[PDB]
Assembly symmetry: C5
Homo-oligomer: 196 residues x 5
């Protein structure tokens, strides 16, 4: 098997519409890159971050004995978790090529760099303790038995008007009026402040 | 039947162009779940709203025997027929913020609940008083009349606490209107959003 | 015939690229703007932001069907139909289509398409704040089809105009023209819709 | 042959990826200015609306009791890869993207375009006006594959008015490539009305 | 072989999804040709740049016998494999201003040079001084590591707009190889340092 073959098989046989269930365990980890437009009045922030998403799809696995361990695949050719930011107020602008990593064991990783507007608590952004903006990310349509989400300044721009004090992640499981099942989400708390 | 099979059948056989009318109008439930109010302009009479447009209807052609099968799957709306709902007083096109997937239940019940950000032209007068403004949003089928599509109704439950606004009350009303172009009557739902500045 | 069959036939056999001209005559296209809202007037720059239904009506017999025991009408995605290449000559933004892009096809082959459009125009905004109002003239015609392939004609009424606009409509008049352009020897038809409107209090 | 047949043949057999070179393709470019929307004399940026009348020949589209002309989606035709070198926004096409194909194989495409340019806006408020120079040519085809050549509707409601339009053809060599690429420079001489 | 045949083969047989690796990483040349600097903000540390992103690599599977054939064709990038380059410090998605066509030479040499407008996060301090600001732009493969894709640099103002509010003092390029937390391999990038300043009074 070479890359050409592996990609050919994936394209022919992966079922992008089909959740690779046996719940699918989805890792979500936000890597903040920039904070661009804070508004303390309206409580809205403009954030640039890598949405590192990781899950497993065994139907993509291959014998890597004399083959590559990894390939890059267009996400249009793969099933992808339907993650959404609940408190996003703009649709996600994907800044990067929409390719994922598929490892021979069936491990998939997709890490787009996203610019997005959020509605969150921006109060205290200009103080030393800073503001704490809470970002809620989960599967839009898959409940806890189908998709489970779990957590996992390094790449933060030194040229931002803001710095990052702390990032904490917290997993929740919420029931909504529409549906009887529980949906999981990850709440990433971004504690940041305006530099001097 | 597993998911793979069900989704395969749906994709192969659903007819997204074809309204799944049975014997009668497809009965479409519409329920707006307000999430945020973002800009208000009392001069221009325009508001910017974020809301879940929970839409529910029935398509028997999608039904399957759920004996030893899943009760529910998630399907791309591009592979399903979807009611052609529009907000009559919208002045921007709907920005869909969420993955465009619907629920199909084994009985053929379909639910689609996108989160939408949209601008409306409505009555914003009194937004800064304590009785608040009452913005009326009109949603109905754009091209299907009452005998093809009928719409029916189903507050601060998911509304953001970080909005500069708060919701006093949400009331829903069903109407049936005849337009100059066409002899038949088209149904709509008018959702009245009563809100005020904090 | 049921809906499924009719839609199937249309999808298989309609030729969206092919103007349904008959007997070497022109396709008669009705254009009627139903104004919904006026959003952003600028008397300095002479630009207005308008929301309107562009009710477009024409005939493709090749879509026609025996409606004896069949529906009289279906809704069809415009991507599956030939559509007149109408353009607003004095538009300065591309048309933002607000509504689902579906047309009516009636069993006789009559097609109607009525998108709600938001668009900016360059027009005469002078007098918008007076009692006689401004008169903005909107020019709509086929971009590439001349008078012998496409003819445009007017069809009526503040009927659907928003009561919550800062503006109110005094009068709407329509007037058909036939113009020759430098590029081409043939004449192209257009409709000029005159929107007479003014600011409210 | 009727329209249906001609369009069917074009669709089946035209090769949109294939430049209709005959043993360069001669492309006519003629900007018909419709409107000038915004001008910043500080930033040297203008917002213009114009018809980009483009004309060329593709014999592989020619045909013999038939129509002399059809309207064809440009996605079904080969189209010159023209670009405005000093544009700073991508072109917003305002009009239906259809071209004229004439039975002899002459193709004309005239989209109405709104676009922002970086050019000399100095003097826009004087009597002699500013002169904004717009540079249009093939992005990827050199002079042997594509040659560009030069060849009223301006709105009376613009704040601006057009004094003169002059066109001039150039042939430039770029660092990347050994061949020369042709362009047309359209000089738009305009001023603010008083 | 004529153009039609060569383009037909390419469309039929090129594998856009498949990196054209040849026993060794694909060698990708990156060279930014700055055209304009549009909107500097010294407070927010953001710049709006227009530049040609001249990208060059080799794909032997596209090669052909050019004996009685063209030496070069223009091919839609959707029919070719293209390096997944990204600007790490870009804060808007790249606006491609030009037709998305690449050159394929008969030897399999591919060149793609879109004109891009993009907003970057970088050091804008000193933009109004005589020594100027130095904005550092980091471009590399998003998903291919050093053994799959290697990036290499290839004057300054050759095509820079004389009508910009800015002038270019110097452009330097620097190749790096970085390991990220996610992955065990090293990813290459090029850092283009754009030294520019506000033009005087
Ligand atoms: Br269909 C369908 C059903 C439920 C939901 N949501 C409710 C449950 C958790 N995610 C938020 C939206 C969305 N689409
Ligand atoms: Br085609 C076609 C026919 C009628 C309508 N409208 C009239 C019927 C009710 N909703 C408003 C849209 C739109 N397109
Ligand atoms: Br192709 C082609 C030929 C002519 C025109 N125009 C001229 C005739 C009427 N509308 C204005 C544009 C547009 N495209
Ligand atoms: Br591939 C490729 C090669 C060269 C060019 N440029 C240089 C020659 C003509 N105009 C500027 C574009 C564009 N793409
Ligand atoms: Br999938 C996948 C793997 C690696 C990366 N990044 C890390 C390595 C270099 N480019 C920056 C993003 C992103 N997505």
């Amino acid at each position: 098997l070479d890359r050409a073959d592996i990609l050919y098989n994936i394209r022919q046989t992966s079922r992008p519409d089909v959740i690779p269930t046996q719940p699918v365990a989805v890792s979500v980890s936000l890597k903040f890159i920039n904070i661009l437009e804070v508004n303390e009045i309206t409580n809205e922030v403009d954030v640039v971050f890598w949405q590192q998403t990781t899950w497993s799809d065994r139907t993509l696995a291959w014998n890597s004995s004399h083959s590559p361990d990894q390939v890059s695949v267009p996400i249009s050719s793969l099933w992808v978790p339907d993650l959404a930011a609940y408190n996003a107020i703009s649709k996600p602008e994907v800044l990067t090529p929409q390719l994922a990593h598929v490892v021979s064991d069936g491990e998939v990783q997709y890490t787009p760099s996203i610019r997005q507007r959020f509605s969150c608590d921006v109060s205290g952004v200009d103080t030393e303790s800073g503001a704490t903006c809470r970002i809620k990310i989960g599967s839009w349509t898959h409940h806890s038995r189908e998709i489970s989400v779990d957590p996992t300044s390094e790449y933060f721009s030194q040229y931002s008007r803001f710095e990052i004090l702390d990032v904490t992640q917290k997993k929740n499981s919420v029931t909504y009026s529409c549906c009887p099942e529980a949906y999981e989400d990850v709440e990433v708390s971004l504690n940041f402040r305006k530099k001097g």
